[PDB]
Amino acid sequence: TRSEYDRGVNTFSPEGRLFQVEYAIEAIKLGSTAIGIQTSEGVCLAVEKRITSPLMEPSSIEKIVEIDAHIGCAMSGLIADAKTLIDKARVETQNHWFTYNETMTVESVTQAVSNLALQFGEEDAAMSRPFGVALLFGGVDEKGPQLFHMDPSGTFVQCDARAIGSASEGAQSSLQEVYHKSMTLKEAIKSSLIILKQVMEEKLNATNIELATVQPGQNFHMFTKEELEEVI
Amino acid sequence: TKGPDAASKLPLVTPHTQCRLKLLKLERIKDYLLMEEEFIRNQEQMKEERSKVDDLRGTPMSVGTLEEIIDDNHAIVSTSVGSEHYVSILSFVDKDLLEPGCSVLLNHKVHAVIGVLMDDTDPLVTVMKVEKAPQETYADIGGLDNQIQEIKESVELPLTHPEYYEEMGIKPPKGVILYGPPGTGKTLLAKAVANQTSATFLRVVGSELIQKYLGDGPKLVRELFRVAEEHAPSIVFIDEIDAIGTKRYDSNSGGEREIQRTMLELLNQLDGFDSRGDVKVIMATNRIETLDPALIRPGRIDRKIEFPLPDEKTKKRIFQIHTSRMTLADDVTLDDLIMAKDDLSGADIKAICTEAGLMALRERRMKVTNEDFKKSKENVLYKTPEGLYL
């Protein structure tokens, strides 16, 4: 049936579906899992790496990348698209700071990255397929710590705790069970690591996971090797 | 459910190289065989009421098909004319063997029940049955070690070790494809299974399930699988399944739909509504990309074995096998052919060996040489533009 309705982003199906958009959403699944948490003390991000074998340095599988001094970004999906949208995010944050001399709120930043992900095939901009990447922007704006999830179809929303990636449906349940509002960042780190361990194949061991935290204080902190060992 | 039939195979004298040990062993075979023949001839040559009863039995007994037995001594039978009769039942039948669809025996004149013929298997399937033991044991299968291990797990081990699976509730695989290029051993790995398997082996050819009469194909298939289940814990080798296995399409002709019907009946047999006994299906094909997911499914075909063009070590071992029985010359290093990464099949190695022997014979010699192998390869091999890469 979907032989003439799902081969183009601009041909509606009888249901009213953008099947290329759902296919990009599926391509999100393939990626390595990420788990972002937002609590009263900041925002945490814990992601799984999929190191195939040594001789591939740690600093090429970029799941966490720093967005301004007050946001971190966890990627799930195609790397080229991830680079493009992270670059859009950085240039937007810095342009907003340049023009308004203030730190872009995470709502604004994820809104604008979504605004880029919107223009699939509009003849006023230049892509032709949805940016097949689902991103988590976890930052600290004037409303306290916040965490905003973006899906490839340009939809972004606040999330007090969200997991993305291959381990999406298998970790949303755990997050649902464990999360509670009055949570401290230490609890957030431990809980995210526990859920990652639950839904990974290799044994979590400080060189198959990345961790970062953006706090109402010290900037985005990427946990270093010794800190990884301590937490683990 | 009569029980396994398998095949009768005489023992295999271990030596192959021409040896007085081989002569002695083979004369051992000879003497025991002569002894068996003696016992037979001697005992069966040297060494009433039922006779007259079977005389009363109609001499030219016909065959009908029973339908709706009635009463204790009056059963309905049919005839090969489309007619049917309310025939009588004699006292010679064991009874309880008479079931609808049973091919019964009848008297020429009286047309009574005078037999049950619980042995009627279609000729097109009994000819396909295997009773020879083809001498291709797992010794001439150069390399292919992983494939042989998988096929052994599929076919042998739930016969010679039915404890591993029962120890942990798992159930053995039921089907295995062997798929790959033209000449890899997909049929040798079936021949060797026939050799070492004490279970019945059933030839099958996809081009043999397509029958002229409409609807006859999806009855020949049922006959085949019913014979397999009834007659043995057996193995069914559908060679060249690409003869019927093509993907089901809408089609607009009669023949294509009939072939698809044969496919559907095969699938219903492999995993239908009811169940499958201890029949293990081994299928063969040159292209697996042109088959229906219905039969490539992992419920009817639980294992798939590629037969990739053998690698360098396997190719070496294959030259070893197919030259072992030849008078080699010391000036022959079986590595000139190995090193070259030219597509070489197992059949291609066999043909190279044969052709090399032939070139020697033309040179008036009976022992191969390096130049002879070179010429054999060159005149045997049958069959991306430069600079487009690198």
């Binding site: - | 081009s207 993907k247 809408d250 040159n286 030849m326 022997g357």
Partner: protein, 152 residues
């Protein structure tokens, strides 16, 4: 065509006449020959000469003879032909224009020559397969082999 005559003679005559040479060498008996060439360079005159000079049952299968309308007929015909050959062994089976009865295995289901393809598959199995042949030689001829199927 002296070299071609010598090669065809080798493959067909030498085994049936003198199997002992092959046995002593230890090499599997050659089992089939196939002829290339433009239209008018032997490829059936050689078959005619071989038939005229052979002491074995010569048979012809040339043409589209294996392609008959009713399904489940070509495979039966090829099988019964090889039954005839095995019965009257030793024998040489000629097949002119094998590309007709057996060529590239193109996809089927909608617009593929599935029936002639099945005929070819049965021929494949009978030439070589489980319970192979003893002294039946098969000669094939084709004016252009390019499309002739790899399994054959």
């Amino acid at each position: 065509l002296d070299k071609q005559i010598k090669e065809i003679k080798e493959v067909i005559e030498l085994p049936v006449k003198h199997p002992e040479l092959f046995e002593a060498l230890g090499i599997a008996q050659p089992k089939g020959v196939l002829l290339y060439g433009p239209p008018g360079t032997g490829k059936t005159l050689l078959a005619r000469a071989v038939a005229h000079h052979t002491d074995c049952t010569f048979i012809r299968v040339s043409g589209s003879e294996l392609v008959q309308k009713f399904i489940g007929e070509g495979a039966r015909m090829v099988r019964e032909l090889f039954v005839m050959a095995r019965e009257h062994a030793p024998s040489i089976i000629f097949m002119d224009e094998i590309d007709s009865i057996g060529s590239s295995r193109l996809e089927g289901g909608s617009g593929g020559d599935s029936e002639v393809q099945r005929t070819m598959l049965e021929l494949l199995n009978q030439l070589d397969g489980f319970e192979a042949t003893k002294n039946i030689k098969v000669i094939m001829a084709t004016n252009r082999i390019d499309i002739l199927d790899s399994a054959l």
